Amino acid sequence: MNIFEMLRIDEGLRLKIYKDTEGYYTIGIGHLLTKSPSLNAAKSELDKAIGRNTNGVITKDEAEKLFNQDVDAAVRGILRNAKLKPVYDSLDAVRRAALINMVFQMGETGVAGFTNSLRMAQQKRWDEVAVNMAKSRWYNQTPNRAKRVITTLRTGTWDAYK
Ligand SMILES: [Cl-]
Ligand SMILES: [Cl-]
Numbered sequence: 001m002n003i004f005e006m007l008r009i010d011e012g013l014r015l016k017i018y019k020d021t022e023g024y025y026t027i028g029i030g031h032l033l034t035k036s037p038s039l040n041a042a043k044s045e046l047d048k049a050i051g052r053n054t055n056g057v058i059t060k061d062e063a064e065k066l067f068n069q070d071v072d073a074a075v076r077g078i079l080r081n082a083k084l085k086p087v088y089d090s091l092d093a094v095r096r097a098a099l100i101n102m103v104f105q106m107g108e109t110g111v112a113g114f115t116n117s118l119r120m121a122q123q124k125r126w127d128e129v130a131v132n133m134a135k136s137r138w139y140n141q142t143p144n145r146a147k148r149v150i151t152t153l154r155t156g157t158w159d160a161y162k
Contacts, residue, residue: 001158028063098152130154
């Protein structure tokens with residue numbers, strides 16, 4: 001298992017513009033297009049991301065291309081982030097993937113808002129991190145996904161995904 005397979009499971013793959021769990025226009029593998037309520041604005045952002053007149057539909061390859069870019073950006077974002085970098089550096093490989101998943105999903109800002117958990121993560125207090133992270137909108141809104149991510153961070157294994 002790896003970060004790509006991990007996210008692919010959590011996000012799925014859709015070749016047509018769709019609304020995410022929060023109601024935002026998305027496509028491919030969890031690629032947020034826009035927060036605006038306009039399908040057109042959505043269609044606009046899409047063509048611009050893809051480089052062609054898509055008409056709200058993309059191919060598998062195009063989806064995977066956005067995906068690659070998105071994972072890369074998530075990783076780079078973490079590493080440039082003052083609050084995230086040190087956590088990341090302190091973790092093992094599996095747990096790192098968990099942090100990338102979170103950032104992919106909620107943004108650097110969003111993850112950066114889990115201060116207390118991040119600090120505990122650095123201290124390697126696994127059970128406490130999981131408890132704390134469960135106390136969040138994130139967990140209440142997408143519980144199954146959140147549980148998978150939390151288990152990963154807690155245990156350091158891919159069990160939640162096998
Ligand atoms: Cl883009
Ligand atoms: Cl869920």
